[PDB]
Amino acid sequence: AMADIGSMKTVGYAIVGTGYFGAELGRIMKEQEGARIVAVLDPENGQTIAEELDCDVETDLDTLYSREDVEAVIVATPNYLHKEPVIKAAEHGVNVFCEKPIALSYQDCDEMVRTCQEHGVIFMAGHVMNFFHGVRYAKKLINDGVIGKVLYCHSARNGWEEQQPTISWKKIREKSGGHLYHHIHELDCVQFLMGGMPEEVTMTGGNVAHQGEAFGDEDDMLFVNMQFSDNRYAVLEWGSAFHWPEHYVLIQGTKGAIKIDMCDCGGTLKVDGREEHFLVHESQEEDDDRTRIYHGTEMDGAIMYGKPGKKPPMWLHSIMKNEMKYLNGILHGKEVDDEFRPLLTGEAARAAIATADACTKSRFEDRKVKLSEIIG
Amino acid sequence: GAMADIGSMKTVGYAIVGTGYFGAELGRIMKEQEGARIVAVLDPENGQTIAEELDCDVETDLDTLYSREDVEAVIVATPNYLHKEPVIKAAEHGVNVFCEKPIALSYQDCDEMVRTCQEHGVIFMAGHVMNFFHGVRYAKKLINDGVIGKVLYCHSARNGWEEQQPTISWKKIREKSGGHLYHHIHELDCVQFLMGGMPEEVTMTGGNVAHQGEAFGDEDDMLFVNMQFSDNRYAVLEWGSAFHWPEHYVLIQGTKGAIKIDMCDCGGTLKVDGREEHFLVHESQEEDDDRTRIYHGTEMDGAIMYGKPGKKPPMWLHSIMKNEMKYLNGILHGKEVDDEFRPLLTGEAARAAIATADACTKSRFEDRKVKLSEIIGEG
Ligand SMILES: NC(=O)c1ccc[n+]([C@@H]2O[C@H](COP(=O)([O-])OP(=O)(O)OC[C@H]3O[C@@H](n4cnc5c(N)ncnc54)[C@H](O)[C@@H]3O)[C@@H](O)[C@H]2O)c1
Ligand SMILES: NC(=O)c1ccc[n+]([C@@H]2O[C@H](COP(=O)([O-])OP(=O)(O)OC[C@H]3O[C@@H](n4cnc5c(N)ncnc54)[C@H](O)[C@@H]3O)[C@@H](O)[C@H]2O)c1
């Protein structure tokens, strides 16, 4: 509207990593008012996406970020290649949006957050599950006291992956971190719901059914047992060797419970002997579409993993728009909502990777691990 | 049966030690079995009443009871902490033993009970009655038949919401019941049956999160167990009484498919090769649906599901008690023990259940992962 003048500067975005997710974030951000995609860097797919978005290609991160028209960057490289794009952005005074998992070590994540703070640039952690209607609603119910004190969260993200003709980087521990880091969404969600990191974790599991030359080396079953301060608990399950598919977050408090189901897609509140239902995504059509995708891909979860040339489904495209609108607002000086502030302070980024590192160490060293061992 | 069953059957004389909710009903059931007689009961509070109902004698002393010429076997249905002396003294008198779960509240006790019965050459049947559920027998058949391939992972839950009762049952006193883990050991025994024995290593976490008014009972109301089995296999087991999202099931996941035994929304599911099949957990669709009705009635307070003297087990439980008492009576009339039930007679399922429960307990109290070798040694 006419009243927007004063607030509608064009923010120039770079995209580093324009595959499945980076190309689609670029498509979405290009459509946002006051945003332009000026340049992309992606050795394999940059030329193709630059032609689609009508923007430039760069090949060197310092050259890209030295451009006067590059003010912000969306970092959507593979999980193991987030650090250099973020560090060099901060060194050039470029504002950062970074895909999950922020990094595959706490040291990397800590350095990325710290370097952005030292250079006075924004660092937004792309923990997109926080934008789900169902998650926002669960947090509101908790804040409103509807389920009393949260005692216990149980998450699962369990399916069956068939042998593929090729092994994606997403299946290789050194490149993806495996399920715990690639699917860190659930861990971050539980930490948001329970008010931070646990004190101590145990993780068990292994590669039970995907060992050999035709498979990646990631664990295909992971089971986390978290002990929080003040006598509270969480159980988190992941993997790719489960012929009983489950994907949900279950929240149990002194007065009620909340389930966010992403397989039979929908939210349930139990309180005082009644049930209420709520949407996980932004419409019944989005929830029902997600249900159809899970039912259609039951015999092989590998089909849900993005790769260059593929497009995110309806529910994911829709929340990516919400998240890119939120980022664009922050970069046009809209005040950070309390609810999402931990995605900008570094607190959620550090907490997610600290706990993931503690779980990893617990599983590989076969012992309980205190978060203090990771964070100091 | 068969043509060979013609002729009078030898009567086996049964004692019952503990005739509360469960012992009184086991007596009613065994009395109806051919070739079985209930001859005497010992129960300080309820023995006179149950003996009048079953038309049998009352004893007050275990050695006197077992020295009776007519006592050949005993059903031990005392509270969880009072199983050892009735079993040991039965064995010392050459009396065959059926013992309620949990066999005992320590591995030392359980092991001594098994060893003493072996020393005296008497039968010792572990009353792990969940092995007599139609849906558990069917799940085992599917697994043995290779339908779901190698079992990789079992997940059990037995989670509800219990209100504090005006007066506290022995079942809520940890030294008397052993708390959820031992009083509801059914799920732990079920997982170990399906995964072929004890795990190598366990972790248990939990606490009294919502029953601070009952802290004197020293029981956790939430328990979470993480089991690591040999050859890269796992289990997760949940229990407790502070869960406003009720769940009671055993989920079995293998290389080729999965089986769920649901005891809340009562029914079995097989998932394999892109299809689902339904099967019964109990003896009929009516028994499953009755169990579902019971769980809907107890959702706001699971405390009402606990038996106490004067109460009768529900239909599904009466049915498996009949299955189990018929099995026991057959063994005591010289029927050969099936491979399926043999671990209930060898001591192996009894020792495995209590060994793992003790390891879980130690893990929770010491706040660390515990190897089963700490309990059982290096073999
Ligand atoms: N919902 C979500 O938040 C969501 C979903 C999918 C993926 N992701 C995240 O998005 C990121 C990318 O995953 P994806 O699904 O797009 O993977 P993808 O394999 O589809 O794309 C990765 C792209 O990175 C490019 N690339 C590789 N090395 C590079 C380098 N050095 N510099 C620049 N580009 C490089 C590749 O050429 C490719 O185009 C990861 O962090 C992943 O975890 C997030
Ligand atoms: N397998 C199952 O499905 C199932 C279900 C319920 C109970 N049980 C088991 O049955 C046993 C008894 O539980 P319950 O539900 O009947 O409890 P209950 O409280 O109803 O009955 C316990 C009985 O033990 C008697 N008793 C107490 N001390 C005794 C002693 N020293 N000698 C003899 N009798 C004594 C009491 O008088 C009472 O009659 C326990 O092992 C319990 O775990 C098993």
CA–CA separation, B88 and B120 (whole Å): 10
Answer whether B42 contacts ligand 2 (Cβ < 6 A): yes
Cβ-Cβ contacts under 8 Å, B363 against chain A:
none
Whether the ω angle into residue B314 lies within 30 degrees of 0, i.e. cis, is: no
A44 alpha carbon to ligand 1 midpoint, in Å?
11
First to last CA, chain B: 42
CA–CA separation, B71 and B48 (whole Å): 18
Answer whether B22 contacts ligand 2 (Cβ < 6 A): yes
Name the one residue in this structure whose structure tokens are 């003297």: B309
| Residue spans of beta strands (DSSP E) within B87-199 | 96-100, 124-127, 151-161
The one-character DSSP state at B235 is: E
CA–CA separation, A165 and A183 (whole Å): 22
Measure A235 CA to nearest chain B CA, in Å.
8
Answer whether B308 contacts ligand 2 (Cβ < 6 A): yes
Whether the ω angle into residue B343 lies within 30 degrees of 0, i.e. cis, is: no
Report helix angle A106-118 to A347-365, nearest 10.
160
B280 phi, psi to nearest 5 deg: -85, 140
Answer whether B319 contacts ligand 2 (Cβ < 6 A): no
Which ligand has its closest atom nearest to the C-alpha of B306?
2
Cα A96 to Cα A15, A30, A59, A188, distances in angstroms: 10, 17, 18, 19
Which ligand has its closest atom nearest to the C-alpha of A77?
1
CA–CA separation, A89 and B372 (whole Å): 52
- The beta-carbon neighbor of A151 closest among B222, B251, B272 is B222
What is the Cβ-side half-sphere exposure of residue A218, based on CA atoms within 13 angstroms? 26
Tokens found for residue B35: 């070739």
Q: Find out whether A26 and A1 touch, Cβ atoms under 8 Å.
A: no
CATH of A130-312+339-375, one of 3.40.47.10, 3.30.360.10, 3.40.50.2300, 2.30.40.10: 3.30.360.10
Measure A341 CA to nearest chain B CA, in Å.
30
Per-residue buried b or exposed e for B58-68, using 16+ beta carbons within 10 Å of the residue's own CB: bbeebeebbeb
Nearest-10 Cα torsion for A69, A74, A77, A81: 80
- Residue boundaries of the structural domains of chain B: 3-127, 132-310+346-376
B248 phi, psi to nearest 5 deg: -150, 105
Binding site for NAD(+): residue ranges of A? 20-21, 42, 45, 79, 82, 99-100, 169-170
Query: What resolution, expressed in A, was reported for this entry?
Result: 1.7
CATH of B132-310+346-376, one of 1.10.3720.10, 3.40.50.300, 3.30.360.10, 3.10.100.10: 3.30.360.10
Which ligand has its closest atom nearest to the C-alpha of A85?
1
Residues 6+ apart with CB under 8 A from A241: A160, A161, A208, A209, A210, A220, A221, B152, B153, B253
Query: Are the folds of B3-127 and B132-310+346-376 the same?
Result: no
Cβ-Cβ contacts under 8 Å, B251 against chain A:
244
The CATH classification number of B3-127 equals 3.40.50.720
Residues 6+ apart with CB under 8 A from B302: B160, B161, B162, B241, B246
* Interface residue A256 vs chain B (CB under 8 A): yes
- C-alpha closest to that of A26 among A324, A310, A326: A324
Taking residue A162's Cβ as centre, other Cβ atoms within 10 Å add up to 11
- Say yes or no for a CB contact (<8 Å) between A227 and B205: yes
Per-residue buried b or exposed e for A11-23, using 16+ beta carbons within 10 Å of the residue's own CB: bbbbbbbbbbbbb
Tokens found for residue A48: 């193709």
Answer whether A128 contacts ligand 1 (Cβ < 6 A): yes
Q: Which CATH superfamily is domain A2-126 in?
A: NAD(P)-binding Rossmann-like Domain (3.40.50.720)
Structure-determination technique? X-ray
Measure B277 CA to nearest chain A CA, in Å.
13
Residues in chain A, total: 376
- Say yes or no for a CB contact (<8 Å) between A208 and B152: yes
CA–CA separation, B145 and A3 (whole Å): 73
Taking residue B39's Cβ as centre, other Cβ atoms within 10 Å add up to 21
Measure B317 CA to nearest chain A CA, in Å.
26
| DSSP-based three-state secondary structure for B137 | helix
Answer whether B127 contacts ligand 2 (Cβ < 6 A): yes
